[PDB]
Amino acid sequence: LVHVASVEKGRSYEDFQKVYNAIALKLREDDEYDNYIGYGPVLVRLAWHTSGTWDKHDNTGGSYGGTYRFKKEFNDPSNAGLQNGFKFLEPIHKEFPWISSGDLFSLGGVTAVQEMQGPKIPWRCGRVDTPEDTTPDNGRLPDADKDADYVRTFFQRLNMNDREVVALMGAHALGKTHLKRSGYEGPWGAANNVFTNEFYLNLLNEDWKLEKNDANNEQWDSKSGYMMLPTDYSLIQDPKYLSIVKEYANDQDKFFKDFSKAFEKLLENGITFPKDAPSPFIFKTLEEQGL
Numbered sequence: 001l002v003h004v005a006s007v008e009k010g011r012s013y014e015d016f017q018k019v020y021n022a023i024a025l026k027l028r029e030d031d032e033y034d035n036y037i038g039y040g041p042v043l044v045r046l047a048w049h050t051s052g053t054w055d056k057h058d059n060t061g062g063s064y065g066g067t068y069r070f071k072k073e074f075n076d077p078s079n080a081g082l083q084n085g086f087k088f089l090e091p092i093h094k095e096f097p098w099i100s101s102g103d104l105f106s107l108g109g110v111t112a113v114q115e116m117q118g119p120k121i122p123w124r125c126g127r128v129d130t131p132e133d134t135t136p137d138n139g140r141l142p143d144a145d146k147d148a149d150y151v152r153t154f155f156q157r158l159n160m161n162d163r164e165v166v167a168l169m170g171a172h173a174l175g176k177t178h179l180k181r182s183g184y185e186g187p188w189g190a191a192n193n194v195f196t197n198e199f200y201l202n203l204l205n206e207d208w209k210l211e212k213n214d215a216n217n218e219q220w221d222s223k224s225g226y227m228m229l230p231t232d233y234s235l236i237q238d239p240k241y242l243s244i245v246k247e248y249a250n251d252q253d254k255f256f257k258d259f260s261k262a263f264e265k266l267l268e269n270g271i272t273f274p275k276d277a278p279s280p281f282i283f284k285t286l287e288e289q290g291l
């Protein structure tokens, strides 16, 4: 199936900047969530999980149809906790009922990255809601207890190469694992609602110990109180991933640029943009607008 982007009728960059801004203002206001981490990280994860069901082989899943709104997908065990991001976005959608669900979930992620002082992420509109029966089955999102070979093979289905995978994984600077959600517990670093390359620095520089958490799962833990999932740790066990980790640990701008590309790509898999579609939008942050 071909999913052609269709601009919400009559809308242009200013309409979407208003949606951006409403997301960004609520991110600022609703600051208590998750022990004052705020909603930035879970919105980034919502954008990723709503996009990461894509299968390049048959164009099933992906961000286009906004299918997370249907119970099979919002109740995917892999999506446990993302209901908080959805609930956050509900008043946004009520204010701007014209935006499609896929456009709102993906825009939430862009807005979160940028408001957390991350790179600009160009964003294109035009996702169109598709019906309940287009919701992908559970099981397309990745397991965390696996090795580098798993990770590499997993991401081939999303058409991501080694550099794109290592870049995307840098989002694990953000937020934390929650035991009751994923069976893993702890943050990956100190700056977990500011977008930086800390994930790579911690992988290389902390003294990690392989421990069992209280759900009986193995994770890597440091004396600073940080953790890495087995799939995170695989990025320094595999020599190809390791090189790239070192690159991003040593060049913040490079990480920003590569993350931006990979994240836009993730959010756009599966969508065909007509030749005469608008160019991608680059939203101004609240700070840049003086808001």
Ligand code: HEM
Binding pocket: 041, 042, 044, 045, 048, 081, 142, 143, 144, 145, 151, 168, 169, 171, 172, 174, 175, 176, 177, 178, 179, 181, 182, 183, 184, 229, 231, 263
């Ligand atoms: C091999 C791939 C990946 C695996 C196995 C994985 C696994 C996990 C797990 C287990 C959690 C913790 C969920 C919880 O307990 O709340 C998590 C959190 C998160 N992941 Fe991933 N992840 C992967 C890739 C990504 C990518 C590609 C991104 C986005 C670019 C991403 C962004 C996030 C964010 C932002 C959080 C924190 C959520 C929060 O604090 O609520 N992850 N991930």
